[PDB]
Write an enzyme that holds these catalytic residues in place. Sequence first.
Site, PDB file in Angstrom:
ATOM      1  N   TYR A   1      -2.195  -0.527  10.258  1.00 56.00           N
ATOM      2  CA  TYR A   1      -2.244  -1.015   8.872  1.00 56.00           C
ATOM      3  C   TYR A   1      -0.943  -0.705   8.130  1.00 56.00           C
ATOM      4  O   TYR A   1      -0.415  -1.553   7.413  1.00 56.00           O
ATOM      5  CB  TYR A   1      -3.442  -0.403   8.133  1.00 56.00           C
ATOM      6  CG  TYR A   1      -3.522  -0.708   6.641  1.00 56.00           C
ATOM      7  CD1 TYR A   1      -4.034  -1.923   6.184  1.00 56.00           C
ATOM      8  CD2 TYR A   1      -3.120   0.231   5.691  1.00 56.00           C
ATOM      9  CE1 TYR A   1      -4.125  -2.203   4.825  1.00 56.00           C
ATOM     10  CE2 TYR A   1      -3.212  -0.035   4.332  1.00 56.00           C
ATOM     11  CZ  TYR A   1      -3.714  -1.253   3.903  1.00 56.00           C
ATOM     12  OH  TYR A   1      -3.806  -1.532   2.550  1.00 56.00           O
TER      13      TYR A   1
ATOM     14  N   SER B   1       0.832  -1.202   0.000  1.00 50.53           N
ATOM     15  CA  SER B   1       0.000   0.000   0.000  1.00 50.53           C
ATOM     16  C   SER B   1       0.864   1.249   0.000  1.00 50.53           C
ATOM     17  O   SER B   1       1.909   1.287   0.635  1.00 50.53           O
ATOM     18  CB  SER B   1      -0.891   0.040   1.233  1.00 50.53           C
ATOM     19  OG  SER B   1      -1.229   1.381   1.551  1.00 50.53           O
TER      20      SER B   1
HETATM   21  N1  LIG Z   1      -8.566  -1.030  -1.395  1.00 51.09           N
HETATM   22  C1  LIG Z   1      -7.612  -0.095  -1.453  1.00 51.09           C
HETATM   23  O1  LIG Z   1      -7.832   1.105  -1.651  1.00 51.09           O
HETATM   24  C2  LIG Z   1      -6.308  -0.571  -1.306  1.00 51.09           C
HETATM   25  C3  LIG Z   1      -5.218   0.274  -1.512  1.00 51.09           C
HETATM   26  C4  LIG Z   1      -3.910  -0.193  -1.378  1.00 51.09           C
HETATM   27  C5  LIG Z   1      -3.657  -1.515  -1.039  1.00 51.09           C
HETATM   28  N2  LIG Z   1      -4.746  -2.376  -0.833  1.00 51.09           N
HETATM   29  C6  LIG Z   1      -4.480  -3.779  -0.496  1.00 51.09           C
HETATM   30  O2  LIG Z   1      -5.042  -4.506  -1.597  1.00 51.09           O
HETATM   31  C7  LIG Z   1      -5.336  -5.829  -1.105  1.00 51.09           C
HETATM   32  C8  LIG Z   1      -6.755  -6.155  -1.539  1.00 51.09           C
HETATM   33  O3  LIG Z   1      -7.543  -5.026  -1.177  1.00 51.09           O
HETATM   34  P1  LIG Z   1      -9.114  -4.910  -1.444  1.00 51.09           P
HETATM   35  O4  LIG Z   1      -9.502  -3.507  -1.153  1.00 51.09           O
HETATM   36  O5  LIG Z   1      -9.410  -5.524  -2.759  1.00 51.09           O
HETATM   37  O6  LIG Z   1      -9.692  -5.817  -0.249  1.00 51.09           O
HETATM   38  P2  LIG Z   1     -11.197  -6.398  -0.132  1.00 51.09           P
HETATM   39  O7  LIG Z   1     -12.148  -5.802  -1.093  1.00 51.09           O
HETATM   40  O8  LIG Z   1     -11.658  -6.117   1.400  1.00 51.09           O
HETATM   41  O9  LIG Z   1     -11.011  -7.982  -0.208  1.00 51.09           O
HETATM   42  C9  LIG Z   1     -10.001  -8.568   0.619  1.00 51.09           C
HETATM   43  C10 LIG Z   1      -9.783 -10.037   0.252  1.00 51.09           C
HETATM   44  O10 LIG Z   1      -9.030 -10.561   1.362  1.00 51.09           O
HETATM   45  C11 LIG Z   1      -9.682 -11.738   1.840  1.00 51.09           C
HETATM   46  N3  LIG Z   1      -9.443 -11.772   3.284  1.00 51.09           N
HETATM   47  C12 LIG Z   1      -9.686 -10.831   4.196  1.00 51.09           C
HETATM   48  N4  LIG Z   1      -9.304 -11.315   5.380  1.00 51.09           N
HETATM   49  C13 LIG Z   1      -8.823 -12.553   5.193  1.00 51.09           C
HETATM   50  C14 LIG Z   1      -8.312 -13.473   6.029  1.00 51.09           C
HETATM   51  N5  LIG Z   1      -8.235 -13.169   7.324  1.00 51.09           N
HETATM   52  N6  LIG Z   1      -7.890 -14.664   5.595  1.00 51.09           N
HETATM   53  C15 LIG Z   1      -7.970 -14.964   4.238  1.00 51.09           C
HETATM   54  N7  LIG Z   1      -8.500 -13.996   3.395  1.00 51.09           N
HETATM   55  C16 LIG Z   1      -8.916 -12.824   3.890  1.00 51.09           C
HETATM   56  C17 LIG Z   1     -11.154 -11.542   1.536  1.00 51.09           C
HETATM   57  O11 LIG Z   1     -11.813 -12.840   1.442  1.00 51.09           O
HETATM   58  P3  LIG Z   1     -13.422 -12.964   1.679  1.00 51.09           P
HETATM   59  O12 LIG Z   1     -14.221 -12.584   0.501  1.00 51.09           O
HETATM   60  O13 LIG Z   1     -13.693 -14.489   2.120  1.00 51.09           O
HETATM   61  O14 LIG Z   1     -13.734 -12.033   2.951  1.00 51.09           O
HETATM   62  C18 LIG Z   1     -11.099 -10.822   0.190  1.00 51.09           C
HETATM   63  O15 LIG Z   1     -11.038 -11.770  -0.905  1.00 51.09           O
HETATM   64  C19 LIG Z   1      -5.271  -5.729   0.434  1.00 51.09           C
HETATM   65  O16 LIG Z   1      -4.037  -6.322   0.895  1.00 51.09           O
HETATM   66  C20 LIG Z   1      -5.239  -4.253   0.713  1.00 51.09           C
HETATM   67  O17 LIG Z   1      -4.477  -4.000   1.893  1.00 51.09           O
HETATM   68  C21 LIG Z   1      -6.071  -1.903  -0.973  1.00 51.09           C
HETATM   69  C1  LIG Z   2     -10.299   0.910   1.110  1.00 51.08           C
HETATM   70  C2  LIG Z   2      -9.852   1.689   2.355  1.00 51.08           C
HETATM   71  O1  LIG Z   2     -10.844   1.527   3.365  1.00 51.08           O
HETATM   72  C3  LIG Z   2      -9.704   3.205   2.036  1.00 51.08           C
HETATM   73  C4  LIG Z   2      -8.477   3.693   2.508  1.00 51.08           C
HETATM   74  O2  LIG Z   2      -8.434   4.599   3.339  1.00 51.08           O
HETATM   75  C5  LIG Z   2      -7.331   3.022   2.082  1.00 51.08           C
HETATM   76  C6  LIG Z   2      -7.388   1.648   2.287  1.00 51.08           C
HETATM   77  C7  LIG Z   2      -6.333   0.837   1.916  1.00 51.08           C
HETATM   78  C8  LIG Z   2      -5.229   1.424   1.330  1.00 51.08           C
HETATM   79  O3  LIG Z   2      -4.176   0.663   0.960  1.00 51.08           O
HETATM   80  C9  LIG Z   2      -5.139   2.795   1.092  1.00 51.08           C
HETATM   81  C10 LIG Z   2      -6.205   3.618   1.474  1.00 51.08           C
HETATM   82  C11 LIG Z   2      -6.104   4.994   1.245  1.00 51.08           C
HETATM   83  O4  LIG Z   2      -7.013   5.758   1.566  1.00 51.08           O
HETATM   84  C12 LIG Z   2      -4.961   5.520   0.645  1.00 51.08           C
HETATM   85  C13 LIG Z   2      -4.882   6.895   0.430  1.00 51.08           C
HETATM   86  C14 LIG Z   2      -3.759   7.464  -0.164  1.00 51.08           C
HETATM   87  C15 LIG Z   2      -2.694   6.657  -0.546  1.00 51.08           C
HETATM   88  C16 LIG Z   2      -2.771   5.290  -0.335  1.00 51.08           C
HETATM   89  O5  LIG Z   2      -1.746   4.499  -0.719  1.00 51.08           O
HETATM   90  C17 LIG Z   2      -3.900   4.697   0.258  1.00 51.08           C
HETATM   91  C18 LIG Z   2      -3.996   3.324   0.485  1.00 51.08           C
HETATM   92  O6  LIG Z   2      -3.077   2.581   0.159  1.00 51.08           O
HETATM   93  C19 LIG Z   2      -8.526   1.086   2.889  1.00 51.08           C
END
Ligand SMILES: NC(=O)c1ccc[n+]([C@@H]2O[C@H](COP(=O)([O-])OP(=O)(O)OC[C@H]3O[C@@H](n4cnc5c(N)ncnc54)[C@H](OP(=O)(O)O)[C@@H]3O)[C@@H](O)[C@H]2O)c1
Ligand SMILES: C[C@]1(O)CC(=O)c2c(cc(O)c3c2C(=O)c2cccc(O)c2C3=O)C1
Lengths: 252, 252, 245, 245
Positions: free
Chosen positions: D162, D149
Site C-alpha cells: 500500500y 497517505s
Molecule cells: N481511510 C484512511 O484512514 C485513509 C488514510 C489515508 C489515506 N486514505 C486514502 O483515502 C482514499 C479514500 O479512502 P477511504 O478510507 O475513504 O476509502 P473507502 O471508504 O474504502 O472508499 C474507497 C472508494 O474507492 C472506490 N474504489 C475502491 N476500489 C475501486 C476500484 N477498484 N475502482 C474504482 N473505485 C474503487 C470505492 O467505490 P465503491 O463504493 O463502488 O466500492 C469507494 O468509493 C483512499 O485512496 C485511501 O488510500 C485513507
Molecule cells: C482505514 C485503514 O484500514 C486503517 C489504516 O491502517 C490506514 C489505512 C489507510 C491509510 O492511509 C492509513 C492508515 C493508517 O493506519 C495510518 C496510520 C498512521 C498514519 C497514516 O498516514 C495512516 C494512513 O495513512 C487503511
Amino acid sequence: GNLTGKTALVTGASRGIGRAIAEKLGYAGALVAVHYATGADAAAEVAESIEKDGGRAFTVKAELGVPGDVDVLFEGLERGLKERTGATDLDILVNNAGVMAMGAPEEVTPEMFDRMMAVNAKAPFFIVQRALSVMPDGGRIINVSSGLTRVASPDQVTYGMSKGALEQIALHFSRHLGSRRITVNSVAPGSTDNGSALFQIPEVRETLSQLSTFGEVAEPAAIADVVAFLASEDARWITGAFIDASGGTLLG
Amino acid sequence: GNLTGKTALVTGASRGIGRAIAEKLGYAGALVAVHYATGADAAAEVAESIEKDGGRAFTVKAELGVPGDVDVLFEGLERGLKERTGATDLDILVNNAGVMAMGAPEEVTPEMFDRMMAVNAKAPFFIVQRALSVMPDGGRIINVSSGLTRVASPDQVTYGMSKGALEQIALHFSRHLGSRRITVNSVAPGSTDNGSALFQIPEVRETLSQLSTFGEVAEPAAIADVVAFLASEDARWITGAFIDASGGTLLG
Amino acid sequence: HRSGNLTGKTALVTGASRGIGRAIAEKLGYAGALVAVHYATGADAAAEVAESIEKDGGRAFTVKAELGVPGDVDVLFEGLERGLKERTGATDLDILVNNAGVMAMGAPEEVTPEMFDRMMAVNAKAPFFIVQRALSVMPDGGRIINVSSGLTRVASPDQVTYGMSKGALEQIALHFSRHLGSRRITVNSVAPGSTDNGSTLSQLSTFGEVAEPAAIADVVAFLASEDARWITGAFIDASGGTLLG
Amino acid sequence: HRSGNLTGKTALVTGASRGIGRAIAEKLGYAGALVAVHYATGADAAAEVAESIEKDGGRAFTVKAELGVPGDVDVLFEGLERGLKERTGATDLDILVNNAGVMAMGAPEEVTPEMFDRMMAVNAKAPFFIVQRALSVMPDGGRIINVSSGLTRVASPDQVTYGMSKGALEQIALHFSRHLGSRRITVNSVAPGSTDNGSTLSQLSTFGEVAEPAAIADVVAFLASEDARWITGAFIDASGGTLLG
Ligand SMILES: NC(=O)c1ccc[n+]([C@@H]2O[C@H](COP(=O)([O-])OP(=O)(O)OC[C@H]3O[C@@H](n4cnc5c(N)ncnc54)[C@H](OP(=O)(O)O)[C@@H]3O)[C@@H](O)[C@H]2O)c1
Ligand SMILES: C[C@]1(O)CC(=O)c2c(cc(O)c3c2C(=O)c2cccc(O)c2C3=O)C1
Ligand SMILES: NC(=O)c1ccc[n+]([C@@H]2O[C@H](COP(=O)([O-])OP(=O)(O)OC[C@H]3O[C@@H](n4cnc5c(N)ncnc54)[C@H](OP(=O)(O)O)[C@@H]3O)[C@@H](O)[C@H]2O)c1
Ligand SMILES: NC(=O)c1ccc[n+]([C@@H]2O[C@H](COP(=O)([O-])OP(=O)(O)OC[C@H]3O[C@@H](n4cnc5c(N)ncnc54)[C@H](OP(=O)(O)O)[C@@H]3O)[C@@H](O)[C@H]2O)c1
Ligand SMILES: NC(=O)c1ccc[n+]([C@@H]2O[C@H](COP(=O)([O-])OP(=O)(O)OC[C@H]3O[C@@H](n4cnc5c(N)ncnc54)[C@H](OP(=O)(O)O)[C@@H]3O)[C@@H](O)[C@H]2O)c1
Ligand SMILES: C[C@]1(O)CC(=O)c2c(cc(O)c3c2C(=O)c2cccc(O)c2C3=O)C1
Ligand SMILES: C[C@]1(O)CC(=O)c2c(cc(O)c3c2C(=O)c2cccc(O)c2C3=O)C1
Ligand SMILES: C[C@]1(O)CC(=O)c2c(cc(O)c3c2C(=O)c2cccc(O)c2C3=O)C1
C-alpha cells in the site's frame, strides 16, 4: 590508512561522540586536532590514545559561543598544523561540539536561547567561514546534527531550532563549494551513550532504547564510523546531504 | 466572515506579505493587530484599509531583536485586545516580520548573524512562548518561512540558517500543543514582490520569475490566501506541517 | 584469496553485468564478499565481471534471470541458491543489492499501459519479491540496499513513470527497516544522480560532472559494511549535489 | 442553485460513494462545482451523495467505472464526458481528484504477486492514466489533487505494498507540476492520517483522534480553489500531526 597525509579538526573531541570520531579519524592516518573548552585532561587522553595506536594528534583549547572564540581556535589549530606538517592546510572539518538542554518550553530564557544558538549554530558557521581560507580542494566538512530535527520533542525545542539552523550549512555551502570539490554534509545521530550518568539510569535507558528500531541507544563508535566514511574518498559523490545515523529512529 | 469573533497578530504587517496577510485576515472578520517596527504611517494605512472594508484593526509598535522586545509587543497587543474585545485572547498568530540580507558567505560578520537570528528565529520563539498564556483552544500559529530552506543559495546562507531554525518551531510545538488543538505550521513562499525597488529591475525580475514553474514572482496576495486558509477551521487537521507556497519553485 | 572487511559474506548484486551494478560487484568482491553477478542477457559482460573479481583474488559467479516476468524470482533464486551451496555448502545471503532496472524517456502523453507495467514490474515489483524471498535465507546482521534515483526528488516530466517506479522502490527501505530491526538487517535506499553507465546532464551535479559508477559503488560498499550498522530506513543521497534545488 | 467560489467549474472525484471521497464531493458541490460522483459498485451510495449535493442546491451526477482493469479509463471518461455535455454542452474538466483506492493489511511474507498488481493497478496506475486522459479536456487554471497517505512517511510493515503504491502516486504531483506549469494547472498530493471512513489508530494523531472525512475534504476543497493558486508540486500533510516522529 586511507586518510594518510590528511589533517582534521574535530570540535568537542574531549569526550562522547567527538572523542570517538577523533579516535577513528586518527586510526585512519589523519593528523587530528582534538578540540575542547575546559576538558584539558580528557582531550590529552584522546590525543595520547591516537598516538598510542600509531597516529598523530594535539589538543586545541577554544571556548565557543563567546566573542573571539573562532580566532582563538584557528590561532591554535593553524600553529599546531604548521609546526607538525609545515602547512596550515585543513583537509577535514567536523563540527561536533554541542550543548544540550532539557526543560519545558515555557521556562526557556533568552540567555538559554543565545547560548544554545551561539554554540550550536553560530560557532559552526564561523568555523566553516574561517576554514575556507585553509581548506584544500577535496576537503570535507561534516556537521553533527540530531534526529530531533525530524522528531517532535517539546522539551528540546531550542536545541532543535539550533540544529535545524546547523543543517542549513550543508545545503547552502555545498553549492558554494562544488567547484572546489569540498563536500559538506549533516550527520544525524539518534540517542547515543556519551558516557554521562544519564545513560546509567535503567528506566531512562529503557525509554531511550525503545526509540531505535534496534532497541538500543547507540555506542559513539557507530556514529564515528559514519563520519570516518564521509571523511574519505569513498563519500566523494555525497554533498549537501542529511545522513540518518539514528539506528532507525526516524521511521515515524 | 469565517474568522468572525477571532483575534489575530500579524508581525511585520506594515508592508509586503504581512500587509497582505493582515488585509486578508481582516476581510475574513478577525480583529487584526497590525505590527511594525518603524513603519508607523504604513501600519496605519493597513489598519485603515481593514476598517474601510468593514473590519477591525489597530497597530502595535515593537522593534524585534533587542532585549524587552516581546514585552513591548505583548503589552501593546494585550491592551489593545482588552479595550476592544474585553479579553486578552489571541486566536491567531502569524510570525511574519523578517529581515533579508544578501552577501558573500565570506563577508558575513557576527553582528550580521546575531541580527538575522535575533529577528528571524529568536523573536518568533519568544512570541510563541508569550502567546501560549493568552491563546485559547482551537488557536493558530503560522510562521512565514522561505523556500530557500530547500534551495541552496550561498548568498543567503545565514538567512537560510535562521529560517531553518524557524521551521523547527512548527515541528516541536505542534506536539506540545496537540491537546489544546492549536495548530502550528510553516508557510514557505518563494520569491515574492514585496513592493520594493528590487522587483523593478527588469533583469533581476526576469531571473526571479524563472525560478517559479509559473514563470512569475508571487503577488503577496497569493501567500496571504494560503495563510488565511491555515488560520481557518478548514485547516484544522493540518499541524506541524511545511506548506510549499512557492509556485513550484521547490521541484529540484 | 584476497581478504578484506566482507570476508565471510555472500552477496547478490542484480544487474551486475554493466554500469553501476558492475562497479558495485567489483567493489563488494574486492572487499572479500562472494558475489553473485546477476544479469538478464549480458552473459558475456557478466562473466567478464565475475572473471575480473576472481583475477584480483575475490570470489564470484554469474546468475541468469530476466526480471518482471512470471517466475522471475524463482529462476533467480534457483541459480543463486545453487551457486552458494556449491561454493559454501549453505544458502545464506548476507547482502542484497537491488540494482537492476529500466530507464525510458518520452512525453508523458505517449506513455502506454504496457510501458507502465514494464517499468513497475522491473523497478519496484521484482525488487519487492526479491526482498520477500531473501528474508528466508538472510542471517541477522544482513544488508539490503535498493538503488533508487535522485529523480524521486527532481521533477522530470519525460520520466514520470520511471520516477513513480523508484518512489515505490523507496518505500521498501521505510517499511522493511521497521520489520527487520530486531534481526539487525539494515534496509536503505541509495539515490544516484546522473551516472556514466557507457551509452547537459553534467550541469545537474554541483560538481558539474556526471558520476563514474565507482563513485556510487563506494557508497553501496559502505552501506554493506559493519561501519554502516546504525543507518537503516535511510535515503542516502549520492547525487553529487544534484538535489540542491 | 446555490452559488459559491467554484461556480462555473466541473469536477471529478473518483470513489465519491463513501468515506473521504464522499466528503470531498459534498464539499466541492457545496462550493458550486458540478461534481461527477464516481464509484465502482456502490451506485446506491453514489446516488445518495449526488442527491445530497443537488438537494443543498448544487449540481451532480454519478459515473460507474471499475478501476485497475483493462479499459477502465475509457469507461470512466465515456460516462464523465457524456454527463458534462448533457449538463454544460462541453467536455471541460476543471478539477480532478484521484481519491479512489484500495487498502490491505497482512504480513509482508504473505503478499502475493496478485495482491501486488491489484494495489498498484488501482492506487498508482489508474491515477496516472486518469491524469494522462484528463489533460486533453482540462482548461488552464485547472486543478489535480491526488489523495495519498501519511503512510508514505511512517513505517508500517503490514502495509508495505500500500505504501509502495502511494509513493508511486506521490510522484505524479512532482513531475506533472513541472509539466503543466505554463498551463497553470496545479498538481498536489494530500496525505491524510487515520480517517474514520465507517467500517489504537487514534493514538497516532497529535490530537489523539482519528479524522472525520470532512477534515480532509476541507483541505482538498482549498487546493481546488483559486486561494491555493501558488501551491503546486506540494506534499500537503493532512494527518493531524501524525508525521511528527
Ligand atoms: N481511510 C484512511 O484512514 C485513509 C488514510 C489515508 C489515506 N486514505 C486514502 O483515502 C482514499 C479514500 O479512502 P477511504 O478510507 O475513504 O476509502 P473507502 O471508504 O474504502 O472508499 C474507497 C472508494 O474507492 C472506490 N474504489 C475502491 N476500489 C475501486 C476500484 N477498484 N475502482 C474504482 N473505485 C474503487 C470505492 O467505490 P465503491 O463504493 O463502488 O466500492 C469507494 O468509493 C483512499 O485512496 C485511501 O488510500 C485513507
Ligand atoms: C482505514 C485503514 O484500514 C486503517 C489504516 O491502517 C490506514 C489505512 C489507510 C491509510 O492511509 C492509513 C492508515 C493508517 O493506519 C495510518 C496510520 C498512521 C498514519 C497514516 O498516514 C495512516 C494512513 O495513512 C487503511
Ligand atoms: N549524545 C546524544 O544523544 C546525541 C544525539 C544526537 C546528536 N548529538 C550531538 O553530538 C555532539 C556531541 O555530543 P555528545 O553527547 O557526544 O558529547 P557531550 O559529553 O556533551 O560532549 C560535548 C563536547 O562538546 C564540547 N563543548 C561543549 N560546549 C563547548 C563550547 N561552548 N565550546 C567548545 N566546546 C564545547 C565539550 O568539551 P569539554 O569537555 O571541554 O566541555 C565536549 O567535548 C553534539 O553536537 C550533540 O548535539 C548527541
Ligand atoms: N519577499 C520574499 O521574496 C520573501 C520570500 C519568502 C519568504 N519571505 C518572508 O516573508 C516575510 C515578510 O517579508 P517581505 O519581503 O514581505 O517584507 P519586507 O518589506 O521586508 O517587509 C518586512 C516587514 O517586517 C518588519 N520588520 C523587519 N524587522 C523588524 C524588526 N526587527 N522588528 C519588528 N518588525 C520588523 C517590517 O516592519 P517596518 O515597516 O516597521 O520596518 C516590515 O513590515 C519575511 O519573514 C520574509 O523572510 C519573503
Ligand atoms: N544511470 C544513471 O544515470 C542512473 C542514475 C540514478 C539511478 N540509476 C539506477 O541505477 C541502476 C543501474 O543503472 P545503470 O545506468 O547502471 O543501468 P544499465 O547500464 O542500463 O544496466 C542495467 C542492468 O540491469 C539489468 N537489467 C535490465 N533489465 C533487466 C531485467 N528486466 N531483468 C534483469 N536485469 C535487467 C541489465 O542486465 P543486461 O546486461 O542482461 O541487460 C544491466 O546489468 C538502475 O536501477 C538505474 O535506475 C541510474
Ligand atoms: C544525550 C541527551 O542528554 C539525551 C537526549 O535526550 C538526547 C540528547 C541529544 C540528542 O541529540 C538526542 C537525544 C535523544 O534522546 C534523542 C532521542 C531520539 C532521537 C534523537 O535524535 C535524539 C537526539 O538526537 C541529549
Ligand atoms: C525579496 C528578496 O530581497 C529577494 C530574494 O532574493 C529573496 C528574498 C527572500 C526570500 O525568502 C527568497 C528570495 C528569493 O529570491 C527566492 C528565490 C527562489 C526561491 C525562494 O524560496 C526565494 C526566497 O525565499 C529576499
Ligand atoms: C541514464 C539515463 O538515461 C539518463 C537520465 O536521464 C537519467 C537516468 C536515470 C537516472 O536515475 C537519472 C537520470 C538523470 O538524468 C538524472 C538527472 C538529475 C538527477 C537525477 O537523479 C537523475 C537520475 O537519477 C537514465
